[PDB]
C-alpha cells in the first residue's frame, strides 16, 4: 500500500506492521530482509554504533 | 518509501530499535535523528549536551542519570559531579518543544528549575529521583510558571526545606496535574492550598503525600479525588475513634480505581483495616515504613489476591510469607527490608524459610530483594530449582562473610544454582562468605547478567577475572571491599569498553595500575576518587580509595572537583 489520496487510518495499519517487521532486528537483519544496501564506509558505520551504544542506550 | 518512513518510525520507541534503524542506511540515519522524541542518557558523562542536541534536534523528552548507584551507600563524596545545569542550559535554547525531563541522582539547583520553567513553554513532566541541591524555592518557580505541568514527582530527593509556601504558587487557573509525589518533603505544605489543588485537578491520578499531612485529613482529600489510581498516605497515626476510622473507610471505598498504596508512616494497627475495600483490586503495596507486626501484615495481605508487588519490613516474617505464598498467586516482585540492622540480634523471625516459601508459592516471582541474617545453599538451591524464571535477585545477609549456618560452607554452590538455573537472571547482588569459586559459576553461567554487585566476597583477582572474562551481557559491575586489584583489571582492559561502568572502592587497585589503564585506554575515563590528597604523593603501588571507570565519547570531564583525578 501506497496512497496519494490519504486514507489516514490505513497508513496507520501498514506502518504499525512494517514497523513490526523491524523491532528487535539488527541493522543487518533489517537491511537484508528489505534489500537496502549499506552505504556506510565502515569508519562512519562505527562511529555511529559507538555513539548509539555508549551514549543512547 | 519516504514520508511513509517518518510514519513507520513513530511506531518504534525502544532505544535499541531506534539505534538499530539509524544504522541501516545513511537515509535512515537521517530521517530517524529528525523524528526521535526521546533520548535515554544512562551516564551523563558519556556524551555531551552539544553532541546530543546536534544529532536529535527535535527532542521532546530527556532522561539522564548522574552518580553511580553506590552513591546511595554514601560511597561517593559530595561534589563528585552530576551537575545537570550544562544540560538545561544547552537544551534551554535548542529544545523549544521540550516536555519531560527525568533525572536520576543529579545535582539540580534553583536556577536550574528557574531556567527549565522560563524556557520550556510546553513543559509537562518533572521527575527528580534521588536528586539534591535545590530547595522549595525552586519548586515554587516551577509551580508559579509551568502552566502545563502534568507530573511533579520528587521520589527520594534531598530538598532544602525552606517551607511549604511553594505549593500555593500553582495558580487557580491550573488544572492539569496528573501525578504528584511529594513524599520526601519534610516541610508542611498548606492543607487548604493542597485541597483546593486536588479538587480543580480532575486528572489527578497518583497522589503521594508527605508525612506532615496527618491521617485525619486524608479522608477529605480522598473525597476530592475519587479517581486516584495510586495513593501514598501521609502520617497514618491518630487517636483511635470511630468517626475517624469511618470517614477513612468510606473515603477509600469511594476510590474504586486505586491499585497502589503506600506511605503508612508511624502506622497504627487499629487504622489499617480501613484500607480493605481497596485490598482486593490492589497490585502494588508498600508497607516499608509501617512498623507493624506480623499478624497485622498478614490480615492485610490475606485479602489482596491480585497483588503483584510487595515491599514490606521484615516484621512480616517466615509465617508472614508462608501466607503470601498461598495468597498472592500473582506476586511478581518481593522486597523485604530489614527492621533494625546495626543490632546483630534477630529481632524478628525472618529467616530463609521465607524466601524459600515464597518461591515454591508464586509461580510468577521473578524479582527479589531480601535482607535476612542467615542462609544456606539448600535454600538457594531450592529457590533456584523452583524459580527458573527469576530475572533479578539481590540477597543481602546481615553478618558479612556469614556462611551456610548448617554446613559452614561458604555460599558458592548457593549462588551457583541461581546463576545456573535462572538463565535470564539479569541482575544479581551477592553476599555471604564467598570464595573465587562463585565467580567461576558466575562467569561460566550468568550469561545474561547485566548488573552485578559484590561486597566482602572473593579470594584474588581470579574472581574479578572470571567475571569480566565470562559475562557476556555485563553493563554495571560494582565492588567494594573485595581482594581484587590490578591483574584482573588490566588483563580485561577492553571488556571495560563493552560496559557502561565499573566502580571499585576499598579494593586493592594501586594508583600505578590506574595510570596505566588510562593510557592504555584513551576512551575510558578512569577516575580516582580519593580524599587523602594527590595520589602521586603516595607510592604508585598503594591502593586508591576508589576508582570509577566508564566509557565515554566526550573524553574527560570538566567539573571534576579537587579529589578526583582523571587517570
Ligand atoms: O536500566 P538501568 O540503566 O540499568 O537502570 C536500573 C534499572 O532501572 P530501569 O530498568 O527502570 O531503567 C533497575 O531496574 P530493575 O533492575 O529493578 O529492573 C533499577 O532497579 P530498581 O528496581 O531498584 O529501580 C536500578 O536502580 P538502582 O540501580 O538504584 O537499584 C537502575 O540502576 P541505575 O542506578 O543504573 O539506574
Ligand atoms: C548504607 C546507607 C548509607 C544506609 O544507604 C542506604 O540507606 N541504603 C539503602 C540500602 C539499599 C539496598 C540495596 C541492596 C543491594 C542491591 O544491589 O540490591 C545489595 C544487596 N546485596 C549486596 C551486596 C553488595 C553490594 C550491594 C548489595
CA-to-CA distance for B405 and B399, rounded, in angstroms?
Answer: 11
Rounded to an integer, what distance in angstroms lies between the CA atom of residue B367 and that of residue B365? 6
CA dist., res. B182 & res. B211, Å (int): 9
Cell of B221: 482529600
**How far is the alpha carbon of B37 from chain A, nearest alpha carbon, in Å?**
13
- For Cα atoms B87, B65, B520, give the angle at the middle one, nearest 5 degrees: 95
For chain A, what's the residue count?
57
d(CA B554, CA B558) in angstroms, rounded, equals 10
C-alpha cell at B38: 526521546
Closest Cα of chain A to B128: distance in Å? 20
> B499, B477 in Cβ contact below 8 A?
yes
Q: Where are the domains of chain A?
A: 1-57
Tally of CB atoms within 10 A around B164: 21
Contacts with B552 from chain A: Cβ below 8 Å: 54
Backbone φ, ψ for residue B386 (5° rounding): -70, -35
Q: Residue holding cell 586489584?
A: B485
Distance between CA atoms of A53 and B387, rounded to whole angstroms? 31
Contact indicator for B264, B289 with CB cutoff of 8 Å:
yes
Alpha helices of B39-99 — where are they, by DSSP H?
49-54, 85-94
Backbone φ, ψ for residue B505 (5° rounding): -145, 140
What is d(CA A22, CA B16) in angstroms, rounded to the nearest whole number?
11
B452-474 in b/e burial notation, b at 16+ Cβ within 10 A?
bbbbbbbeebbbbbbbbbbbeeb
Asked whether the beta carbons of B47 and A55 are under 8 A apart, the reply is yes
Report residue B76: phi and psi, to 5°. Answer: -125, 110
- Chosen for mutation from A1, A36, A54 (greatest number of chain B CBs closer than 10 Å) is A54
User: What determination technique applies here?
Assistant: X-ray
| A-chain residues near B10 (CB < 8 A) | 15, 19
**What residues does B454 pair with on adjacent strands?**
B479
| Nearest Cα to Cα of residue B469 among B493, B492, B437 | B492
- Residue B369 near ligand 1, beta carbon < 6 Å: no
Nearest CA among B167, B183, B178 for reference residue B232: B183
Domains along chain B with CATH numbers: 1-36 (1.20.1280.50), 37-567 (3.80.10.10)
Residues 6+ apart with CB under 8 A from B282: B258, B259, B260, B261, B304, B306, B307
Query: Which letter does DSSP use for residue B373 in this model?
Result: S
What does the alpha-carbon distance between residue B62 and residue B37 come to, in Å, rounded to a whole number? 9
Whether A54 contacts B553, CB under 8 Å: yes
Nearest CA to ligand 1 atom 35: B69
**Sole residue written with cell 534477630:** B346
Q: Please give the Cα distance from B314 to B340 (Å, whole number).
A: 9
Select the residue of A11, A45, A57 nearest B15 (Cβ to Cβ). Answer: A57
For B553, the closest of A15, A38, A55 (CB atoms) is A55
Report which of A38, A4, A17, A54 is spatially closest to residue B523, judged by C-alpha positions. A54
Please calculate the CA angle B495-B499-B500 and round it to the nearest 5 degrees.
150
Which of B409, B406, B411, B402 has the alpha carbon at shortest distance from B383?
A: B411
Integer Cα distance of B460 and B435 in angstroms: 9
B427 has binding-site annotation: yes
Whether B563 and chain A come into contact, CB under 8 Å, resolves to no
B210 secondary structure, DSSP code: -
Known binding residue B469? Answer is: no
B-proximal residues of A, 1-57, CB under 8 Å: 11-12, 15-16, 18-20, 22-27, 30-31, 36-40, 45, 48-57
Q: β-strands B524-529, B546-551: how paired? A: antiparallel
Q: Which grid cell is B525? A: 575515563
Q: What is the 3-state secondary structure (H, E, C) of B169-205?
A: HCCCCCCCCCEEECCCCCCCCCHHHHHHHHHHCCCCC
CA separation, residue B346 to residues B16, B288, B335, B342, B370 (Å):
46, 18, 18, 11, 15
**Residue B2 to residue B27: CA distance in whole angstroms:** 9
B32: DSSP letter: H
Helix, strand, coil % in chain B, rounded to nearest 5: 35, 20, 45
- What are the residues facing B181 on neighbouring strands? B153, B208
Tell me how far apart the alpha carbons of residues B350 and B353 are, in angstroms, rounded to a whole number: 8
Distance separating the N- and C-terminal Cα atoms of chain B: 49
| Chain center to CA of B248 | 31
Which residue in the set B16, B51, B552 is minimally distant from A57, CB to CB? B16
Q: Which of B287, B289, B231 is nearest to B265 (CA)?
A: B289
**Which residues are CB-contacts of B105 (< 8 A; sequence separation ≥ 6)?**
B65, B66, B67, B71, B82, B129, B130, B131
Q: Is B351 helix (H, G, I), strand (E, B) or coil?
A: coil
Contact partners, residue B246, CB within 8 Å, separation at least 6 = none
Q: How far apart are CA B524 and CA B45, in angstroms?
A: 11
Residue B29 near residue B69 (C-beta atoms within 8 A): no
HSE of B111 in the Cβ direction (CA atoms, 13 Å)?
Answer: 5
For this entry, resolution in Å reads: 2.6
Amino acid at each position: 500500500a501506497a496512497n496519494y489520496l490519504n486514507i489516514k487510518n490505513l497508513l496507520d495499519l501498514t506502518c504499525q506492521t512494517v514497523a513490526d517487521m523491524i523491532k528487535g532486528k539488527t541493522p543487518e537483519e533489517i537491511r537484508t530482509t528489505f534489500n537496502i544496501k549499506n552505504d556506510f564506509t565502515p569508519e562512519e558505520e562505527e562511529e555511529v554504533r559507538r555513539e548509539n551504544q555508549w551514549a543512547f542506550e | 518509501p519516504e514520508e511513509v518512513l517518518e510514519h513507520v518510525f513513530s511506531f518504534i520507541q525502544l532505544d535499541k530499535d531506534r539505534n538499530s534503524v539509524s544504522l541501516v542506511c545513511k537515509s535512515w540515519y537521517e530521517i530517524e535523528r529528525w523524528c526521535r522524541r526521546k533520548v535515554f542518557i544512562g551516564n551523563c558523562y558519556a556524551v555531551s549536551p552539544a553532541t546530543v542536541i546536534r544529532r536529535f534536534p527535535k527532542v521532546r523528552s530527556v532522561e539522564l542519570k548522574g552518580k553511580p548507584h553506590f552513591a546511595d551507600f554514601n560511597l561517593v563524596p559530595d561534589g563528585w559531579g552530576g551537575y545537570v545545569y550544562p544540560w538545561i542550559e544547552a537544551m534551554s535554547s535548542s529544545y523549544t518543544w521540550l516536555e519531560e525531563i527525568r533525572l536520576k541522582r543529579m545535582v539540580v539547583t534553583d536556577d536550574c528549575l528557574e531556567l527549565i520553567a522560563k524556557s520550556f513553554k510546553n513543559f509537562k513532566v518533572l521527575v527528580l529521583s534521588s536528586c539534591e541541591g535545590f530547595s522549595t524555592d525552586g519548586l515554587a518557580a516551577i509551580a508559579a510558571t509551568c502552566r502545563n505541568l502534568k507530573e511533579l514527582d520528587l521520589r527520594e530527593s534531598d530538598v532544602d526545606d525552606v517551607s511549604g509556601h511553594w505549593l500555593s504558587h500553582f495558580p487557580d487557573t491550573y488544572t492539569s496535574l496528573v501525578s504528584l509525589n511529594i513524599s520526601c518533603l519534610a516541610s508542611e505544605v498548606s492543607f487548604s492550598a493542597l485541597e483546593r489543588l486536588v479538587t480543580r485537578c480532575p486528572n489527578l491520578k497518583s497522589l503521594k503525600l508527605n508525612r506532615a499531612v496527618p491521617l485525619e485529613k486524608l479522608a477529605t482529600l480522598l473525597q476530592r479525588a475519587p479517581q486516584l489510581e495510586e495513593l501514598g498516605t501521609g502520617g497514618y497515626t491518630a487517636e483511635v475513634r470511630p468517626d475517624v476510622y469511618s470517614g477513612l473507610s468510606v473515603a477509600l471505598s469511594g476510590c474504586k480505581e486505586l491499585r497502589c498504596l503506600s506511605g503508612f508512616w508511624d502506622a497504627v494497627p487499629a487504622y489499617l483495616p480501613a484500607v480493605y475495600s481497596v485490598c482486593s483490586r490492589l497490585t502494588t503495596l508498600n508497607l516499608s515504613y509501617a512498623t507493624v507486626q506480623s499478624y497485622d501484615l498478614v490480615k492485610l495481605l490475606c485479602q489482596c489476591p491480585k497483588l503483584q508487588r510487595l515491599w514490606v519490613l521484615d516484621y512480616i516474617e517466615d509465617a508472614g510469607l508462608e501466607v503470601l505464598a498461598s495468597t498472592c498467586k500473582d506476586l511478581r516482585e518481593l522486597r523485604v527490608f530489614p527492621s533494625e540492622p546495626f543490632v546483630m540480634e534477630p529481632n524478628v523471625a525472618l529467616t530463609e524459610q521465607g524466601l524459600v516459601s515464597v518461591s515454591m508459592g508464586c509461580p510468577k516471582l521473578e524479582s527479589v530483594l531480601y535482607f535476612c541474617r542467615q542462609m544456606t545453599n539448600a535454600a538457594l538451591i531450592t529457590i533456584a530449582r523452583n524459580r527458573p524464571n527469576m530475572t533479578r535477585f539481590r540477597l543481602c545477609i546481615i553478618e558479612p562473610k556469614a556462611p551456610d549456618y548448617l554446613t559452614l560452607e561458604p555460599l558458592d554452590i548457593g549462588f551457583g544454582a541461581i546463576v545456573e538455573h535462572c538463565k535470564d537472571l539479569r541482575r544479581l547482588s551477592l553476599s555471604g562468605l564467598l570464595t573465587d569459586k562463585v565467580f567461576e559459576y558466575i562467569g561460566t553461567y550468568a550469561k545474561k547478567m547485566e548488573m552485578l554487585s559484590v561486597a566482602f566476597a572473593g579470594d584474588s583477582d581470579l574472581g574479578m577475572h572470571h567475571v569480566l572474562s565470562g559475562c557476556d551481557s555485563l553493563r554495571k559491575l560494582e565492588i567494594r571491599d573485595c581482594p581484587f586489584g590490578d591483574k584482573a583489571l588490566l588483563a580485561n582492559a577492553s571488556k571495560l569498553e563493552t560496559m557502561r561502568s565499573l566502580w571499585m572502592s576499598s579494593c586493592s587497585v594501586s594508583f600505578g595500575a590506574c595510570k596505566l589503564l588510562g593510557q592504555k585506554m584513551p576512551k575510558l575515563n578512569v577516575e580516582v576518587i580519593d580524599e587523602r590528597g594527590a595520589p602521586d604523593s603516595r607510592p604508585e603501588s598503594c591502593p586508591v580509595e576508589r576508582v570509577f571507570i566508564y566509557r565515554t565519547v566526550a573524553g574527560p570531564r570538566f567539573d571534576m572537583p579537587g579529589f578526583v583525578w582523571n587517570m
